């Protein structure tokens, strides 16, 4: 599937909000694995919503959360040094 979303960052955190409302907390399946950044967004409509994120590289998985705002979903992953990741995905 797909989702909408959209992405901010600190010098120091990646920040990812998932532009999704229809939502609770038990749906969203975040897992960081030293890999993508594969958010599974089980909708109540029982079908998943599902980003796949190939991050610029992969991260330590404990830097990594998420949260759900209410309008959106805010997953943020903490770099592991303070460097600017100028485009979000592997050579977006």
Known sequence: SKIKYDW????SQ??????IKNVQKNDVNVEFSE???SALVKLPSGEDYNLKLELLHPI???QSTFKVLST?????LKKPEAV?????????
């Open 72 to 76: 959106k979903i805010e997953i943020k």
């Open 35 to 37: 890999k993508e950044l």
């Open 60 to 62: 330590i998985p404990e």
């Open 14 to 19: 990646v920040v990812i909000t998932l532009m």
């Open 84 to 92: 600017r990741w100028e485009k979000l995905e592997g050579q977006g």
């Open 8 to 11: 901010y960052q600190t010098e």
